[PDB]
Amino acid sequence: EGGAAMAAGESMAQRMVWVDLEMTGLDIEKDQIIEMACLITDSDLNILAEGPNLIIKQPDELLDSMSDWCKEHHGKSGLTKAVKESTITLQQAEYEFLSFVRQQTPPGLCPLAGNSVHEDKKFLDKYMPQFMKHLHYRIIDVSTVKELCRRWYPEEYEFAPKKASHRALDDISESIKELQFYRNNIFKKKIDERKIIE
Amino acid sequence: GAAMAAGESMAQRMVWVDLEMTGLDIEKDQIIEMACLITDSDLNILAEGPNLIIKQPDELLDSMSDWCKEHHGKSGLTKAVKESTITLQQAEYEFLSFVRQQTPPGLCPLAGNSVHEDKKFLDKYMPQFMKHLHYRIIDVSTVKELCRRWYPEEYEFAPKKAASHRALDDISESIKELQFYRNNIFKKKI
Ligand SMILES: [Ca+2]
């Protein structure tokens, strides 16, 4: 029956693809991608799968030509060291994600999720196009609600969680924890604590 | 101290835009129409920018998709492109001039419906303008997707975007949409 595929299809079309990227800089015409994580959640931000957490090999030239902040940032992170000794091609990494997201999402219906992802999509559109061809053109920006919280709910902004990490996969988990804080505190309450709300 | 409160009050103004390309192939597509507008933090419009139509080389206009051909052909917009005398470089200045007197430099974000795609062409074709803007954005298409999943009943009350033929009136729908999500999806305080 289609009514079952509809319920199943309409439920997967509400899932999100959560990514966290690290790059050599902000200039898309010269900078590249060096670390990418992926992860799938449902409409209520519950982990349905954990994608890989990869480090992409990039030539020593670009890393040696990175900005002070960038060359300093990724140095203490040790990520710069791993990039050189990495053996993961971009498309080899691009495909590894594409297979993961294909076995978990319908093609062209799920949106990109994550914190400040208008830049991640900007890079994935250029460098991982087959990946983006699977995803909806829209994004779920955890920072968009951070701004709307900053102006509309400054009181509860002070209680927002604090930073914490080691892998982009963890920066995803914090970004959901960030977004989950917004649903508990600034959106309309659906649940009293002991009835539910009208 | 009181000035730092008003300084914060200005740091929370938004910069609203909406563009119309010949296509989404950023490496081979250009901007064709643009409007701009400013609001305070609580979505009240403070100043409306211009609404300009950018002349673009003719071979590309008949090389854009049948969607872009028929739709912009039906909008009357592609006709105004040839009859436009505004280039990209002067258009950027007019928009850069407008916003500089209303918003603090680099403290205000882009806002609108899927502006992540409007910013992609602004990061490339209007960098002097984008320098005045914060790197963060405010996409109403993000809380729309959040409204579907979490508040689907109230999501059905969503108004129809009035199919505006001018990008400045398109924004009026986006704000009216965003104001909706605030009223019926965000927690009220008293
Ligand atoms: Ca638009």
Author numbering:
A (entry chain A): 28 to 191, 193 to 221, 224 to 228
B (entry chain B): 30 to 219
Quote the study that presented this structure, word for word.
We crystallized the full-length protein that lacked the N-terminal MTS sequence. These crystals diffracted X-rays to 3.1 Å resolution and belonged to the P 32 space group. The asymmetric unit of the crystal contained two dimers of REXO2. The active site comprised Asp47, Glu49, Asp147, Asp199 and His194 and had the typical architecture of the DEDDh superfamily. We observed only one Ca2+ ion that was coordinated by Asp47. Each dimer in the asymmetric unit interacted with one molecule of RNA that was located at the active site. Both RNA molecules comprised three nucleotides with an AUC sequence. The 3′ terminus of the RNA was located in a pocket that was formed by Glu49, His101, Cys97 and the backbone of Met50 and was shielded from the solvent.
The human Orn ortholog was proposed to be REXO2, also called small fragment nuclease (Sfn). The protomers of the dimer adopted a typical RNase H fold of the DEDDh superfamily with a central five-stranded β-sheet with strands that were ordered 3-2-1-4-5 and strand 2 that ran antiparallel to the others.
